[PDB]
Amino acid sequence: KYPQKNAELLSAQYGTNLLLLGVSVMLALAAQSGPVKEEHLLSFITVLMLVQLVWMLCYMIRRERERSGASWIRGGLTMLALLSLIMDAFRIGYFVGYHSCISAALGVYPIVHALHTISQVHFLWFHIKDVIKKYETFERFGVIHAVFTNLLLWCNGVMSETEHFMHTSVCSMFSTSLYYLYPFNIEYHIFVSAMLFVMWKNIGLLLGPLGGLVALASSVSVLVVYLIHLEKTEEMHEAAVSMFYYYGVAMMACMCVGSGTGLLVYRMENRPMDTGSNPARTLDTELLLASSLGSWLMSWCSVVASVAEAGQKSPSFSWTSLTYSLLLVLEKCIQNLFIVESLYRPGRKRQILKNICMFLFMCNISLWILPAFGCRPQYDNPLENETFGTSVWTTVLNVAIPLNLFYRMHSVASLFEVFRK
Amino acid sequence: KYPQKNAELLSAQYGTNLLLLGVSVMLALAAQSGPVKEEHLLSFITVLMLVQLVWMLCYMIRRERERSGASWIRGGLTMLALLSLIMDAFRIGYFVGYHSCISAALGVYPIVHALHTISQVHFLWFHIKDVIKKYETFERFGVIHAVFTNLLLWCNGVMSETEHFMHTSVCSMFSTSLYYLYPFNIEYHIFVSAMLFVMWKNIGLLLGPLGGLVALASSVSVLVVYLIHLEKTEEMHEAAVSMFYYYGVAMMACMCVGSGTGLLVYRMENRPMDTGSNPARTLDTELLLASSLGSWLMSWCSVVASVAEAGQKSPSFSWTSLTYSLLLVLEKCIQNLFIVESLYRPGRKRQILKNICMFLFMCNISLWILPAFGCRPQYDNPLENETFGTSVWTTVLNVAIPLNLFYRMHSVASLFEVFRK
Numbered sequence: 155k156y157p158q159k160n161a162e163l164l165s166a167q168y169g170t171n172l173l174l175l176g177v178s179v180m181l182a183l184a185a186q187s188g189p190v191k192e193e194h195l196l197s198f199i200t201v202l203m204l205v206q207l208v209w210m211l212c213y214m215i216r217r218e219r220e221r222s223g224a225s226w227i228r229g230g231l232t233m234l235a236l237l238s239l240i241m242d243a244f245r246i247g248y249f250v251g252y253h254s255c256i257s258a259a260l261g262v263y264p265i266v267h268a269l270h271t272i273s274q275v276h277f278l279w280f281h282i283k284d285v286i287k288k289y290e291t292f293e294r295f296g297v298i299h300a301v302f303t304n305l306l307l308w309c310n311g312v313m314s315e316t317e318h319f320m321h322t323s324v325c326s327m328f329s330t331s332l333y334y335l336y337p338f339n340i341e342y343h344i345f346v347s348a349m350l351f352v353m354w355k356n357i358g359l360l361l362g363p364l365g366g367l368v369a370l371a372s373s374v375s376v377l378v379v380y381l382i383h384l385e386k387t388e389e390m391h392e393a394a395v396s397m398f399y400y401y402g403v404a405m406m407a408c409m410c411v412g413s414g415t416g417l418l419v420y421r422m423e424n425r426p427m428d429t430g431s432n433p434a435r436t437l438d439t440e441l442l443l444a445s446s447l448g449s450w451l452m453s454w455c456s457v458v459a460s461v462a463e464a465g466q467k468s469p470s471f472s473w474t475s476l477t478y479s480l481l482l483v484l485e486k487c488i489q490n491l492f493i494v495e496s497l498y499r500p501g502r503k504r505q506i507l508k509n510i511c512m513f514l515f516m517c518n519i520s521l522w523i524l525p526a527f528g529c530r531p532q533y534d535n536p537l538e539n540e541t542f543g544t545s546v547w548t549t550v551l552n553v554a555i556p557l558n559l560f561y562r563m564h565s566v567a568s569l570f571e572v573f574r575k
Numbered sequence: 576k577y578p579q580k581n582a583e584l585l586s587a588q589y590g591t592n593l594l595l596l597g598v599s600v601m602l603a604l605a606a607q608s609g610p611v612k613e614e615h616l617l618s619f620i621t622v623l624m625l626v627q628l629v630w631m632l633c634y635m636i637r638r639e640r641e642r643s644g645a646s647w648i649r650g651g652l653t654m655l656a657l658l659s660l661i662m663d664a665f666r667i668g669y670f671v672g673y674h675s676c677i678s679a680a681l682g683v684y685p686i687v688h689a690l691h692t693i694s695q696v697h698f699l700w701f702h703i704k705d706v707i708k709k710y711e712t713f714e715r716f717g718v719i720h721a722v723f724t725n726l727l728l729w730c731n732g733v734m735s736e737t738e739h740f741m742h743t744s745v746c747s748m749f750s751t752s753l754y755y756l757y758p759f760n761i762e763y764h765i766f767v768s769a770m771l772f773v774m775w776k777n778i779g780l781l782l783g784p785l786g787g788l789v790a791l792a793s794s795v796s797v798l799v800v801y802l803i804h805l806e807k808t809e810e811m812h813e814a815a816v817s818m819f820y821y822y823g824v825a826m827m828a829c830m831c832v833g834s835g836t837g838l839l840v841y842r843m844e845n846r847p848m849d850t851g852s853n854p855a856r857t858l859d860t861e862l863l864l865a866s867s868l869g870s871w872l873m874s875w876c877s878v879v880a881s882v883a884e885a886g887q888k889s890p891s892f893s894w895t896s897l898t899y900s901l902l903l904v905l906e907k908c909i910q911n912l913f914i915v916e917s918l919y920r921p922g923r924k925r926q927i928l929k930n931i932c933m934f935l936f937m938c939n940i941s942l943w944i945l946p947a948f949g950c951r952p953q954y955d956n957p958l959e960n961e962t963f964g965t966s967v968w969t970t971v972l973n974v975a976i977p978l979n980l981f982y983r984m985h986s987v988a989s990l991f992e993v994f995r996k
């Protein structure tokens with residue numbers, strides 16, 4: 155009835171205009187000397203979530219007229235969805251337990267979002283995982299609408315929520331719970347938009363595990379001492395922060411050595427390389443680069459701030475921030491190159507590669523659990539504050555840290571898939 | 576010696592980090608309460624231009640050890656390069672004719688840029704146009720460095736130049752010449768980055784021409800009356816601005832009717848559509864969408880401002896801004912769909928299609944010459960100012976209008992290629 159290239163071009167233009175309309179509303183909102191208020195942005199996003207709910211309802215009632223590494227993706231989606239639903243339950247509980255002096259749009263939004271989350275998970279659980287069976291104008295509209303709805307939810311969570319949060323026991327528990335649960339909501343929308351992008355575009359092992367266990371035990375130790383000296387008063391806090399930075403430096407140096415050793419083992423073994431012209435390589439490559447973007451931006455902001463301070467011959471320079479930031483950039487570059495080469499290719503080289511893969515696997519688990527459980531000292535750095543401002547540095551960190559969490563989860567799954575080869 | 580997929584991944588990571596370092600410097604610059612000043616950004620971009628000059632020198636001296644619709648692209652590149660070189664000559668002339676109270680980085684930058692421009696044009700003239708003969712790590716590094724150098728030059732021109740310009744006859748001629756020549760410099764860097772993206776990714780005709788001539792004569796008339804009532808004092812200026820808006824509305828309505836008529840002629844003639852799976856279709860499609868982004872953002876900002884003003888039941892609403900902006904969005908959507916379908920497919924349908932193609936060809940020439948020759952009243956709109964602020968609206972227009980010029984040039988060449996079929 156209707157051609158497919160025109161369907162995909164119309165859907166691309168529709169979704170692009172949807173994104174640019176949301177960006178226009180956010181630009182009108184940020185210039186506070188104007189009539190556009192935050193409830194208007196929440197009403198716009200609420201209407202988008204309702205349209206996606208209606209589409210998913212029509213899709214499931216159409217499919218129920220017919221009858222007949224996925225587990226890593228489903229587990230990640232379900233865990234992040236449960237944390238997002240817990241945060242929405244806290245928001246609804248606050249809305250039914252407070253002095254009713256805020257607008258109705260802040261009550262309808264956490265309810266619809268919750269329904270949106272549930273339905274979206276159900277859809278992404280059941281009607282997508284190798285059960286597609288057709289691609290027409292209806293599914294292309296739905297997938298593109300879902301992509302840009304989740305991107306606008308990501309932008310709203312990144313900017314217009316923690317510039318209100320990061321700027322009576324029930325209020326303390328509410329604020330503490332929001333502080334711990336926020337990056338999992340942001341990463342949830344990152345994860346959902348990444349999956350929808352994928353489906354849119356397509357349609358003797360001793361020393362390794364032992365070093366990994368040392369990495370894990372050391373991360374839990376640093377996490378525990380930081381949370382202890384964060385929960386109580388400010389004494390011995392800066393020792394915990396310096397412990398975080400020295401641990402990060404040593405660990406990323408060891409990960410650079412491991413990934414480089416893997417790359418040199420690959421270089422010494424010559425192969426008829428790179429003849430297949432694999433588009434799946436391009437897909438996983440763009441996922442790893444898009445995940446690496448946030449932490450690369452954070453690290454170059456720290457490098458620029460430290461070099462600008464060093465240009466004054468100032469005190470409190472200390473060389474550890476430069477080493478940490480540059481080693482973080484270098485570590486993600488070498489690890490991305492190692493994973494991408496590993497996924498698309500005697501016995502002693504198998505034992506070396508498996509020990510390297512288990513070491514990097516447990517190191518990425520460690521570097522995931524350290525900010526996810528609430529360490530994150532970078533928000534209180536006095537150097538990048540007063541250079542970029544508190545609002546710009548906070549927004550840069552809100553972009554960087556959930557993308558860093560998604561990067562570590564994707565790298566854990568990818569290194570596990572590399573390991574069983 | 577070295578595999579190609581690792582070369583392209585390393586080059587992608589290098590260029591991405593180069594862009595993010597430039598973005599970090601710009602973020603440190605925009606927060607003016609800090610040590611980073613504009614001469615540091617100019618020094619950084621100057622170093623990038625010098626590195627590209629050194630690479631192009633080594634490439635040409637390596638090639639000179641060996642011996643043996645392109646004209647539209649070469650003509651566009653050479654015209655925009657000549658206008659950019661004229662602007663750089665004006666900057667150098669000011670730097671040798673003034674009170675020497677600004678830093679040396681503002682003298683070295685317009686010289687090196689001029690050399691950069693000349694060398695880049697020479698390279699893009701001679702060593703690229705079907706003479707590639709090899710792709711290795713050296714060329715991938717050079718092409719990626721050239722891409723992100725031109726993107727950083729585009730961002731510097733968009734933001735850090737007209738927030739200093741748009742905020743004694745020689746000073747008047749200097750400022751007037753900069754006002755007229757600025758969008759051609761921005762479009763020049765857009766054009767060069769688009770060409771380098773392309774080469775990176777790949778490696779009875781009566782009523783039509785008559786309506787086109789009416790469109791051209793009417794555009795020159797509107798342009799002349801606007802420039803007359805802009806050069807002298809403010810009387811009869813708002814009549815010229817309203818004439819611009821009524822001309823735009825009527826013309827984009829006629830272009831919507833023409834493009835829709837072309838699409839319906841395509842729909843009535845059934846074909847075995849869309850089997851070839853053409854990646855060149857994807858390439859031209861991404862060029863047209865990327866060009867359409869700027870004007871779509873500008874139009875949705877105008878729609879949001881007018882709807883926010885209408886929500887007060889205010890005076891000075893007048894319905895022409897909404898009609899102009901929505902019709903602009905709709906016109907670019909239908910025209911993109913028409914061009915993309917036309918490029919990748921009895922006699923009366925040939926005459927209808929050729930008349931539509933000549934009409935759209937001359938209409939796109941008209942809508943190119945109207946802002947390129949200096950009309951651009953959108954900067955003085957009181958509605959989008961005081962809603963977004965003067966700086967945000969000016970930056971949005973500096974993104975939108977050179978992209979709109981590149982869009983109209985690309986559409987002129989594409990409609991000419993469609994016409995001779």
Ligand SMILES: CC(C)CCC[C@@H](C)[C@H]1CC[C@H]2[C@@H]3CC=C4C[C@@H](OC(=O)CCC(=O)O)CC[C@]4(C)[C@H]3CC[C@]12C
Pocket residue numbers: 177180181184185305309313964967
């Ligand atoms: C290309 C795909 C993968 C992602 C698309 C990226 C956008 C979703 C992001 C990147 C640029 C971001 C914008 C970058 C800057 C700003 C300006 C910001 O307001 C300002 O700082 C203006 C200055 C002021 O008055 O405060 C409002 C949000 C916004 C539009 C951001 C909205 C979200 C955007 C569009």
Ligand SMILES: CC(C)CCC[C@@H](C)[C@H]1CC[C@H]2[C@@H]3CC=C4C[C@@H](OC(=O)CCC(=O)O)CC[C@]4(C)[C@H]3CC[C@]12C
Pocket residue numbers: 435436439440443580583584587591722765768769771772775862865866
């Ligand atoms: C109208 C003009 C202003 C728009 C054209 C600019 C962008 C559409 C292009 C220019 C070069 C492109 C970049 C060129 C290189 C790449 C690397 C690319 O990664 C890969 O090539 C994967 C490598 C592999 O498949 O193995 C990711 C996209 C990116 C950053 C591109 C992002 C989009 C860019 C900036």
Ligand SMILES: CC(C)CCC[C@@H](C)[C@H]1CC[C@H]2[C@@H]3CC=C4C[C@@H](OC(=O)CCC(=O)O)CC[C@]4(C)[C@H]3CC[C@]12C
Pocket residue numbers: 317447451545546549550553591594598602
């Ligand atoms: C693959 C390559 C070619 C594309 C790289 C994407 C970047 C160009 C995007 C991704 C993340 C974006 C950043 C997301 C967040 C921010 C913070 C944002 O800060 C604010 O909006 C100011 C906040 C305030 O004023 O309160 C400014 C834009 C910026 C740096 C964005 C700049 C554009 C970035 C780096």
Ligand SMILES: CC(C)CCC[C@@H](C)[C@H]1CC[C@H]2[C@@H]3CC=C4C[C@@H](OC(=O)CCC(=O)O)CC[C@]4(C)[C@H]3CC[C@]12C
Pocket residue numbers: 543546598601602605606726730734
């Ligand atoms: C993906 C390819 C095709 C293009 C990459 C797009 C970037 C080149 C653009 C889009 C987002 C832009 C950023 C959007 C917002 C800002 C914030 C702006 O400063 C602010 O407004 C912060 C608030 C303030 O303190 O004023 C500085 C420039 C910057 C980083 C822009 C720099 C240029 C960026 C990175």
Ligand SMILES: CC(C)CCC[C@@H](C)[C@H]1CC[C@H]2[C@@H]3CC=C4C[C@@H](OC(=O)CCC(=O)O)CC[C@]4(C)[C@H]3CC[C@]12C
Pocket residue numbers: 159162163166170301344347348350351354441444445856857860861864
């Ligand atoms: C880690 C996560 C947060 C990053 C993943 C987000 C982006 C990389 C993706 C998500 C969906 C993508 C969009 C999906 C649809 C398209 C349409 C696409 O145009 C076409 O499909 C051409 C159609 C044709 O070939 O005929 C241009 C890129 C774009 C906007 C994509 C831009 C990049 C997006 C935003």
Ligand SMILES: CC(C)CCC[C@@H](C)[C@H]1CC[C@H]2[C@@H]3CC=C4C[C@@H](OC(=O)CCC(=O)O)CC[C@]4(C)[C@H]3CC[C@]12C
Pocket residue numbers: 170173177181738868872966967970971974
């Ligand atoms: C294909 C699709 C998926 C990608 C669409 C790209 C957009 C997400 C990019 C392209 C142009 C970018 C805009 C370029 C210019 C600006 C103005 C800029 O304004 C400022 O920096 C504030 C100026 C000041 O404060 O003085 C804010 C970011 C913004 C809206 C950028 C938002 C991000 C945009 C819309």
Ligand SMILES: CC(C)CCC[C@@H](C)[C@H]1CC[C@H]2[C@@H]3CC=C4C[C@@H](O)CC[C@]4(C)[C@H]3CC[C@]12C
Pocket residue numbers: 225226227229230233519522523562563564566567
């Ligand atoms: C393809 C990719 C993105 C899939 C995502 C990988 C997911 C499934 C993996 C990677 C990181 C893993 C987490 C690492 C740490 C812990 C902490 C532990 O106390 C509970 C399990 C939990 C929370 C793991 C759950 C599974 C997990 C989230």
Ligand SMILES: CC(C)CCC[C@@H](C)[C@H]1CC[C@H]2[C@@H]3CC=C4C[C@@H](O)CC[C@]4(C)[C@H]3CC[C@]12C
Pocket residue numbers: 646647648650651654940943944983984985987988
């Ligand atoms: C592939 C695409 C981008 C090629 C670009 C098309 C270029 C070559 C075309 C499209 C618009 C054309 C311009 C339209 C208007 C005029 C004004 C006239 O007084 C001088 C010629 C000039 C300046 C034309 C020169 C050629 C031109 C710039």
